[PDB]
Design a binder for this molecule. Structure first.
Ligand SMILES: Nc1ncnc2c1ncn2[C@@H]1O[C@H](COP(=O)(O)OP(=O)(O)O)[C@@H](O)[C@H]1O
Ligand SMILES: Nc1ncnc2c1ncn2[C@@H]1O[C@H](COP(=O)(O)OP(=O)(O)O)[C@@H](O)[C@H]1O
Ligand SMILES: Nc1ncnc2c1ncn2[C@@H]1O[C@H](COP(=O)(O)OP(=O)(O)O)[C@@H](O)[C@H]1O
Ligand SMILES: Nc1ncnc2c1ncn2[C@@H]1O[C@H](COP(=O)(O)OP(=O)(O)O)[C@@H](O)[C@H]1O
Ligand SMILES: [Zn+2]
Ligand SMILES: [Zn+2]
Lengths: 244, 231, 156, 635, 613
């Protein structure tokens, strides 16, 4: 459920849902979505008269999420594309994007320019010898308290289409990168993605980076630079891509 | 095991201390007779009501399910006493009546107990509304009795002290369930004070990792967790 | 235990359950021919308190290099909650033997390593195992009121 | 439902060929039919194992070809389907069973009395005024031996090369047996007795499971239709010594990037208990599938396991005249030192200590007779090569790493934990070579004291407390925490070993990687001289003889010499001299335990010279070796 | 059936039109007859091209690529009839007569939309022939499966056979047989099973996971389970970049039973694998490639050409790339008579400053090797590197799965951030570097596993930046015992310069200005130097073809250089290290002898690695 609408003193409740036919493979994990559907009941194999509820999805809508699983595909409408071309033809769109980032934060103009450069990002390049070079920039705001750095982190998490917000104290090595968990029914290990897998192709934001543990900071080096997480644990070895 | 039906669902919370007034029934199950060897019946409490056990409740004068609830005549008396000039000084002087002096302490506790207003600007900016108060003082100045009074007084109040409060005893933690071995979240001390007061005793002697793990709750009013595949 | 017939609502009461939950077989109404499907009467039936405490021998009588042998002791009636764990204590009462309840065909339980006795009709082809337990009738343990009137009443 | 096909193999003609081969064949190439003599020995209860050789069958059909007639290719029919041919050969033997020629001892056989009473039953019931299964009367266990040097059974195969097309065929595998279970009885004929009619019935077992009979199916019991209850009797039942073991693929046979597979070998009859764990063996056996029964067979469906019913098992693995030849060769100490581990150069005294580790000391009725030696040296001076080599000369020894210990592990064939022996268990009456003695666990740091002191492995796990046998001499290899050796560093501080361990322990040897130009050359052309030609180089000395040491050291263990009293007085004087030196940097002093170690070295050289007395010059050379250890403590 | 017979004669007409398949079947039969009966067995499979069948009958081609359950068994029957009519053998065996595997079909050619991936395998492609590409994972154990049982009756003296059908074995759906042997015949009285004449096929389950480079943003790679037919069993090891062509099929009740009234579970989907392609790890070598290789081997600076041919985007580290070249073509291994295992695999540890492109060289030797497995300091476990014991799904039996360090056998391991292993992983890594075999003694399992693999690793110093104070202890945070097993300890310093810094700057701006061919300008991506496939062919040719041997004119130079380097962190192992360089340079020259030019280059490279030159 939405964290803005959780009840007082409780936990967000996970609810299992189903999609059929062309509604499948439309959402990436981590998006915020509005869903219309019927609230039906199905019997589960796991007291008295307990039949677990679910929602059969009839409709998916999300402005933050685009193009389902990413295929570098142009699904923007034609008049919106012409409006976007008009914005790209604006002689002072740089100041517009600077003022769009943090309108309620005074100063920090160079930080806002670096934030806009982070949101647009560089270009990923491929060489014939397999040399992969980075197409993203990583920005660290080091400074005194009261400079509204975490508010900039929250606004970056709001503006970016794919974004996650994490802690330094609330983090872990298997939490930011992908983790190795166990399926209950099959008793087989499987890799479940972490915070840098949910932010693939987008922005990860870290708060209190000075305080995250020394074993916890250094699982991120290949995920910042090589744009991949190479995991060889529990009989599973793989190189997942994390373009964060 | 206690059954919650109709309105009683989602009233209780994990870690919340309650007084359940309910019908004590028994039913036959085969597993207890299987593993015990005697004709033994399981016991099931069907709850008729849940009362939150807020505070010490050593006073037996508050007769009701919710002590912080009110009637219409109580609201009329609130509107009567709110229009009295000098109600601020009455609240400050009445805050912790067993402690003499310390007007700055009682004023700061009144400000922290009532709190400000959290603000949302255009769906884009968030402003913290609660007030955090530190009491630095010499021993024998009744700093902890004020904390116990806020425990009695606040609608929701959580206590922690010393080395006994861990970094994940506060904030929130994650744990592996014995059923299906899945990673599930567990609410910490700050989760149980979502619209209330968290109170720390002997703040300096607590470990730095345990002292200052509460920056995101005390600044962003939020707990961001990324561990064990849980964000 | 008291049960009601589901056909003609006849009442059979004072059914005694030794070690498994049992239902009456023959309906006492001669017009009715019911054999199964009897409903329990929770209110009419009479219940007793039960407690199973697990004991082991004291460290004084443990010989060299042996794990302590264990014994289950049943407390019923007034003797429940009399013995707290970890105390040197003496139980006087009855040594009993308990059967495998799952091997007797309990309703709603699947039949469940040492070979025991068999050849019973309730067992069918299954075998029955036995465990040594105790049915204690009296317990002793060998290991406030801050008012004047109650203290002088309690005084000799 | 069950359609029928035709195959070009006649079982009646092949049975006639077998029953003519049993009475016709005789082996005169070695210098009456020999198989008839073997069946006569079966009838005289001399032997219980009948081994049919396929080379004999091939020579018999070759002799038939020499006579001009042609056989029906009997050995190919054995190799295609040996399971039916086992019972066919058993029936051919039972058709040609010779009469006994000695005392029968009729009181021991209960089945003879039972069948006598059943023949009395049959003559009485049919007076009118098969009776038994053939596996009940069989006292012989039939085995097959493959052809060799004459063809699929002749060719040895790996475990991975055994495929699904090899089921039903006599195959041969090469492998190491990992786990051998205990010898368990498996039934073949169950006898049931009727309490009412007084008759019996026999039920044959050819599966992993069987169901018992509840009511008797006798004619007399069913004519009056009394419902007599059958009672199982283990006295008249037919049994066999069954053992299941697991064979593993050899690592040379495993392809690159694969995990070796395991196969089940079931042995029955007189071939039981010959299989040993950790033994590389050749097993020729009938490759049969193992089907389930009931719900497992219904759920797994066509997907079926397999096993191997072993038929033949082959092990892969004057002396005094050679001992006298080694005596007349001269310089047995230097030859046996430089012959051991020919890839290294020099370092003669520590190499003699490595020899005397294998020699060992005498015991007393108790004081341990084991010698223990350590290499307390710099890295890169070939520690692990010496450990592996000294494992390879002396048998009953294993290379181990301290990264070690014995522990019973779970997930066995049974649900309970099996007492799987560790490195210290399998090295008993032998040598254990522990590498990285600095880098080792705290539990092992507890365990080494009980290994040296009381020579047992005391493990208490899952309510089971046991003391396994480890009568083991210890080699240790310990590099220091810093690679370089300096006089500013104390020896005990550099090695970081506890003082109680070295107090128990006898002899440390410290060799250092000191750069000397001529010494580095004499090592360098040797190290690259093993790289010039194939395998071992020329030794420019008396050459190595790797087979020769293992019997000479066994004889050295066999003598156990006893020394005289004046030599003991000289030993007392030398011990007083070393305590006076202990009054005189390495702190390590002479102890009474070092005096016992000096004694152990003394009868070790008494064992090597095959001598009855310990010589005086032998004692002073042993104390010279103690002075060499002191020089090692200095450098 | 009538339509079954019609497709049988249609495929017979197709096999009559193209006589190459008849020639291949005849070649397989005569090879089996020559290598089996007379003084390594070609199985029953043919390479069917979809393209060659497409110009014959487009209806049959669409039937194969759309509804293959009704089209592949008729082609099987037609091919079996052609193989029976072509075979003319006298006096056959009874097991040969009773047990004949039908000639299975293996498919090649273009597939169009049916050539797919395990993620995009969806429900519209069920009961269709598809080609998938991905990583082999979780190979089940090889276990036999009965498809025909032959029994003998002695009272009648007749052999009765019964055919056994499974959902995975047959493309068509038959009534399942409960796999119970017939105890007795209806007229033949008692029946005895005759193993050896019964027909068994090897059964194996693999798991094709999606290739992780083709994963989209925010999603984990998916996987499928592929059944392997008995010809294709053990063709695949885990970590193989396989291309499997097979029928994507669904089986089972799948929750449609009356017990599962409202369970929302789906059907179990598999692929019945018709054929398996390696997709060329050991590339085939045409004679033109051999002519190019032996032409360039005669050049005096072939070492330099093949060194700067490795990673032209990386500036500097020329001796490091020379060591990388000698690492890919590692030296000869010698196994002595007494059993000492002398390592011929050179291993390299590169320690130094950030952004000295050590991890980029790790990525390059990941891409350009025949078999390469990467690992990271905080993304590895010691059990996860060697082997882990787990149950198997189709067996209900415990077995090993190899970790990272064993699956890279006869290959390279690309360790990044080696300075920050957990000590548990350090124990396992040091065990492989000192032993090359791992011993697993747990879960009732006593096994040894071979790992004859090379290691290239990258590391930072214990400080943030590398010190020029030449302190031995602050080079690496790992112990010196693990430093000793590494043959070449290269150290790199990012010393701050002006001219060389401008050269590196202009080189990386030339690197960024590259545009990949055939792509539009400004769009998102979707002195002789030899090409990298030609370099891989050179490495493969040197690896399998030539085995060099060692000769005295390198040896006097080697012992002189060792005495010079040691007598004026040095180890006796360095001698073996020179051999691990020297014959490796012989593998550059392709000669079977080692000369002075190998030893001088070896001494220069080791002096660069230790002293810095
Ligand atoms: N320029 C600014 N404009 C508006 N609010 C600000 C500004 N600077 C600081 N603040 C306020 O002060 C607080 C600063 O918190 P912040 O510095 O983000 O925490 P941290 O020190 O963890 O980064 C914020 O809650 C913000 O509301
Ligand atoms: N007006 C007051 N000022 C100071 N101390 C008081 C007052 N009234 C009561 N106390 C005493 O203070 C004690 C509690 O002090 P406490 O808060 O535990 O000390 P600390 O501040 O060192 O934690 C009580 O026992 C009470 O008797
Ligand atoms: N004759 C020899 N003298 C000295 N060293 C040798 C000789 N032959 C081989 N070596 C080297 O000794 C090394 C063995 O190393 P080892 O002593 O096990 O290291 P550590 O002492 O760190 O365990 C081998 O790598 C080999 O290169
Ligand atoms: N020609 C070059 N010279 C120096 N550095 C380069 C060159 N080309 C690329 N690089 C840089 O090397 C970096 C990779 O090294 P790095 O990731 O620091 O290795 P590690 O992860 O082992 O520390 C890349 O960020 C790239 O920008
Ligand atoms: Zn009734
Ligand atoms: Zn009878």
């Amino acid at each position: 459920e939405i964290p803005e609408l959780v009840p007082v003193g409780e936990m967000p409740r996970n609810l299992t849902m189903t999609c059929d036919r062309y509604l499948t493979n439309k959402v990436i994990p981590g998006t915020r979505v509005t869903i219309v559907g019927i609230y039906s009941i199905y019997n589960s194999k796991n007291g008295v008269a307990i039949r677990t509820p679910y929602i059969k999805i009839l409709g998916i809508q999300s402005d933050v999420e685009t193009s389902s699983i990413w295929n570098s595909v142009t699904m923007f409408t034609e008049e919106e594309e012409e409006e976007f071309l008009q914005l790209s033809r604006n002689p002072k769109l740089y100041e517009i994007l600077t003022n769009s980032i943090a309108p309620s934060i005074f100063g920090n103009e160079d930080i806002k320019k670096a934030i806009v450069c982070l949101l647009m990002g560089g270009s990923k390049k491929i060489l014939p010898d397999g040399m992969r070079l980075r197409g993203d920039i990583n920005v660290l705001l080091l400074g005194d308290p009261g400079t509204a750095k975490s508010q900039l982190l929250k606004f970056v998490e709001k503006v970016s289409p794919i974004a996650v917000y994490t802690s330094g104290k609330g983090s872990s090595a298997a939490g930011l990168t992908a983790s190795v968990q166990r399926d209950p029914m099959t008793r087989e290990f499987y890799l479940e993605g972490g915070a840098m897998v949910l932010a693939d192709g987008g922005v990860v934001c870290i708060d209190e980076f000075d305080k995250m543990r020394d074993e916890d900071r250094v699982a991120i080096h290949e995920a910042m630079e090589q744009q991949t997480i190479s995991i060889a644990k529990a009989g599973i070895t793989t190189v997942l891509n994390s373009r964060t | 095991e206690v059954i919650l039906l109709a309105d009683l669902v989602d009233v209780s919370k994990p870690g919340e201390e309650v007084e359940v007034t309910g019908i004590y029934k028994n039913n036959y199950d085969g597993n207890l007779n299987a593993k015990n060897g005697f004709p033994v019946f399981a016991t099931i409490i069907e709850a008729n009501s849940i009362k939150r056990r807020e505070g010490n409740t050593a006073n037996e004068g508050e007769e009701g399910l919710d002590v912080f609830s009110w009637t219409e005549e109580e609201e009329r008396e609130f509107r009567k006493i709110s229009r009295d000039r000098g109600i601020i000084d009455k609240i400050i002087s009445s805050m912790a009546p067993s402690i003499y002096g310390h007007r700055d302490i009682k004023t700061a506790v009144a400000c922290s107990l009532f709190g400000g207003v959290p603000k949302n600007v255009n769906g884009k900016h968030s402003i913290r509304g609660d007030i955090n108060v530190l009491l630095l003082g010499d021993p024998g100045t009744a700093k902890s009795q004020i904390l116990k009074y806020v425990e009695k007084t606040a609608h929701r109040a959580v206590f922690a002290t010393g080395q006994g409060a861990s970094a994940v005893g506060l904030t929130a933690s994650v744990r592996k369930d014995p059923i299906t071995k899945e990673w599930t979240l567990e609410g910490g001390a700050l989760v149980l004070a979502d619209k209330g007061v968290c109170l720390i005793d002997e703040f300096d002697k607590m470990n730095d990792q345990d002292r200052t793990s509460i920056h995101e709750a005390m600044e962003q009013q939020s707990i961001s967790i990324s561990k064990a595949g849980i964000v | 235990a008291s049960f009601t017939c589901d056909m003609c609502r006849a009442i059979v009461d004072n059914v005694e359950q030794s070690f498994k939950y049992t239902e009456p077989t023959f309906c006492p109404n001669p017009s009715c021919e019911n054999r199964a499907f009897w409903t329990l009467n929770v209110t009419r039936s009479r219940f007793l308190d039960w407690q199973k405490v697990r004991i082991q021998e004291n460290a004084n009588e443990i010989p060299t290099g042996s794990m302590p042998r264990t014994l289950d002791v049943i407390l019923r009636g007034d003797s429940v909650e009399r013995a707290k764990p970890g105390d040197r204590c003496k139980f006087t009462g009855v040594e009993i033997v308990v059967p495998d309840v799952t091997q007797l065909g309990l309703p709603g339980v699947k039949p469940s390593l040492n070979s025991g006795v068999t050849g019973l009709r309730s067992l069918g082809v299954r075998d029955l195992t036995y465990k040594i337990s105790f049915l204690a009738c009296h317990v002793i343990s060998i290991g406030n009121e801050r008012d004047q009137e109650v203290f002088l009443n309690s005084l000799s | 439902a069950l359609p029928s096909i035709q195959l070009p193999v006649d079982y009646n003609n092949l049975f006639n060929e077998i029953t003519d081969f049993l009475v016709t064949f005789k082996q005169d190439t070695l210098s009456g039919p020999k198989y008839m003599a073997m069946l006569q020995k079966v009838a005289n209860r001399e032997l219980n194992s009948v081994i049919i050789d396929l080379d004999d069958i091939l020579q018999y059909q070759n002799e038939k070809f020499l006579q001009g007639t042609q056989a029906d290719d009997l050995v190919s029919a054995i190799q295609q389907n040996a399971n039916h041919f086992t019972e066919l050969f058993c029936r051919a033997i039972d058709n040609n069973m010779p009469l006994p020629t000695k005392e029968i001892d009729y009181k021991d056989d209960v089945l003879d009395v039972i069948l006598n009473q059943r023949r009395l039953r049959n003559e009485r019931m049919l007076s009118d005024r098969e009776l038994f299964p053939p596996n009940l009367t069989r006292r012989y266990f039939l085995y097959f031996k493959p052809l060799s040097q004459n063809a699929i059974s002749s060719k040895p195969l790996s475990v991975r090369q055994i495929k699904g097309d090899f089921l039903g065929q006599l195959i041969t595998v090469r492998g190491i047996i990992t786990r051998v279970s205990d010898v368990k009885p498996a039934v073949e004929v169950i006898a049931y007795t009727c309490d009412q009619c007084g008759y019996e019935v026999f039920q044959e077992v050819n599966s992993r499971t069987f169901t018992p009979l509840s009511e008797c199916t006798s004619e007399e019991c069913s004519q009056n239709q009394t419902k007599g209850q059958l009672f199982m009797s283990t006295r008249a039942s037919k049994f066999s010594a069954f053992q299941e073991c697991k064979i593993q693929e050899l690592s040379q046979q495993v392809p690159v990037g694969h995990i070796p597979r395991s196969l089940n070998i079931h042995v029955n009859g007189t071939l039981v208990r010959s299989l040993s764990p950790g033994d590389i063996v050749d097993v020729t056996g009938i490759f049969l599938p193992a089907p389930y029964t009931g719900f497992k067979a219904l759920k797994a469906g066509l997907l079926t396991e397999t096993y191997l019913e072993a038929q033949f098992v082959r092990q892969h693995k004057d002396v005094e005249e050679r001992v006298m030849e080694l005596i007349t060769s001269g310089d047995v100490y230097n030859r046996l030192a430089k012959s051991i581990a020919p890839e290294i150069y020099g370092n003669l005294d520590v190499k003699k200590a490595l020899l005397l580790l294998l020699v060992g000391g005498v015991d007393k009725r108790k004081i341990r007779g084991d010698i223990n030696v350590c290499l307390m040296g710099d890295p890169g001076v070939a520690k692990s090569q010496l450990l592996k080599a000294i494992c390879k000369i002396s048998p009953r020894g294993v290379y181990t790493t301290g990264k070690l210990t014995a522990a019973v592990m779970k997930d066995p064939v049974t649900d309970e934990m099996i007492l799987e022996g560790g490195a210290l268990v399998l090295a008993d009456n032998g040598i254990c070579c522990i590498d990285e003695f600095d880098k080792m666990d705290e539990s092992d740091r507890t365990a080494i004291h009980e290994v040296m002191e009381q020579q047992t492995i005391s493990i208490s796990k899952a309510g089971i407390n046991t003391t396994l046998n480890a009568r083991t001499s210890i080699l240790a290899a310990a590099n220091p925490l810093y690679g370089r050796y300096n006089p500013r560093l104390s020896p005990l501080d550099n090695i970081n070993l506890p003082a109680a361990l070295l107090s128990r322990f006898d002899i440390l040897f410290l060799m250092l990687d000191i750069p000397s130009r001529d010494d580095d050359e004499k090592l360098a052309e040797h190290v690259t001289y093993v790289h010039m030609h194939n395998k071992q180089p020329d030794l420019d000395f008396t050459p190595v003889e790797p087979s020769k040491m293992r019997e000479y050291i066994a004889y050295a263990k066999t003598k156990r010499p006893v020394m005289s009293e004046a030599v003991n007085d000289y030993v007392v004087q030398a011990y007083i001299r070393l305590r006076q030196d202990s009054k005189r940097f390495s702190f390590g002093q002479a102890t009474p335990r070092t005096l016992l170690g000096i004694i152990r070295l003394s009868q070790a050289l008494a064992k090597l010279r095959l001598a009855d007395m310990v010589d005086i010059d032998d004692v002073e050379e042993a104390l010279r070796l103690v002075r060499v250890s002191k020089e090692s403590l200095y450098q | 059936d009538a339509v079954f017979g019609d497709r049988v004669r249609r495929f017979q007409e197709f096999l009559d039109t193209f006589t190459s398949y008849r020639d291949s079947v005849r070649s397989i039969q005569v090879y089996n007859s020559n290598n089996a009966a007379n003084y390594n067995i070609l199985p029953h499979r043919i390479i069917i091209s979809l393209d060659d069948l497409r110009e014959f009958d487009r209806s049959f081609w669409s039937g194969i690529l759309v509804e293959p359950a009704y089209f592949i068994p008729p082609a099987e029957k037609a091919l079996t009839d052609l193989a029976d009519s072509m075979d003319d053998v006298p006096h056959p065996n009874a097991s040969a007569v009773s047990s004949r595997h039908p000639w299975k079909l293996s498919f090649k050619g273009s597939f169009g939309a049916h050539a797919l991936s395990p993620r995009t395998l969806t429900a519209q492609h069920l009961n269709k022939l598809v080609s998938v590409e991905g990583i082999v994972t979780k190979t089940s154990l090889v276990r036999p499966k009965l498809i025909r049982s032959v029994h003998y009756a002695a009272k009648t003296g007749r052999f009765h056979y019964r055919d056994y059908t499974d959902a995975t074995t047959t493309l068509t759906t038959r009534i399942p047989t409960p796999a119970i042997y017939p105890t007795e015949d209806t007229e033949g009285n008692k029946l005895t099973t005759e193993y050896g004449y019964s027909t068994f096929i090897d059964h194996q389950r693999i798991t094709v996971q999606e290739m992780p480079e083709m994963a989209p943003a925010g999603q984990l790679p998916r996987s499928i389970d592929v059944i392997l037919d008995d010809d294709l069993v053990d063709k695949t090891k885990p970590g193989d970049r396989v291309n499997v062509v097979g029928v994507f099929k669904s089986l089972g009740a799948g929750g449609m039973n009356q017990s599962n009234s409202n369970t929302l579970i789906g059907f179990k989907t598999l692929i019945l694998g018709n054929t398996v392609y390696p997709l060329a790890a050991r590339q085939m070598l045409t004679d033109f490639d051999i002519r190019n290789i032996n032409k360039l081997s005669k050049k005096k600076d072939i070492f330099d050409i093949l060194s700067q041919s490795l990673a032209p985007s990386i500036y500097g580290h020329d001796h490091i790339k020379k060591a990388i070249l000698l690492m890919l073509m590692g030296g000869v291994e010698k196994n002595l008579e007494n059993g000492s295992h002398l390592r011929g695999d050179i291993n390299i540890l590169m320690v130094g400053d950030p952004s000295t492109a050590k991890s980029q060289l790790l990525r390059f030797v990941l891409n350009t090797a025949s078999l390469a497995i990467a690992t990271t300091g905080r993304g590895s476990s010691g059990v996860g590197l060697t082997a882990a014991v787990t149950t198997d799904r189709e067996t209900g039996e415990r077995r090993l799965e190899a970790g990272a360090m064993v699956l890279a056998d006869r290959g390279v391991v690309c360790i990044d951030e080696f300075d920050k292993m957990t000590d548990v992983d350090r124990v396992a890594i040091h065990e492989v570097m000192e032993q090359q075999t791992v011993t697993i003694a747990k879960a009732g399992i006593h096994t040894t596993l071979n790992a004859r693999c090379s290691v290239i690793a990258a590391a930072n110093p214990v400080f943030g930046q590398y010190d020029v104070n030449r302190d031995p202890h602050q080079n690496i945070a790992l112990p010196d015992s693990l430093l000793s097993r590494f043959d070449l300890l290269f150290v790199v310093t990012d010393d701050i310069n002006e001219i060389r810094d401008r050269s590196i700057s202009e080189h990386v701006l030339r690197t960024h200005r590259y545009l990949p061919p055939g792509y539009l300008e400004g769009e998102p991506v979707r002195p002789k130097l030899v090409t990298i496939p030609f370099l891989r062919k050179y490495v493969q040719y040197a690896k399998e073809r030539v085995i060099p041997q060692l000769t005295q004119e390198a040896i006097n130079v080697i012992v002189k250089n060792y005495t010079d380097l040691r007598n004026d962190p040095i180890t006796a192992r360095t001698l073996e290290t020179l051999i691990r360089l020297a014959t490796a340079h012989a593998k550059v020259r392709l000669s079977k002898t080692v000369n002075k030019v190998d030893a001088k280059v070896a001494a220069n490279l080791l002096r660069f690695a230790l002293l810095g030159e």
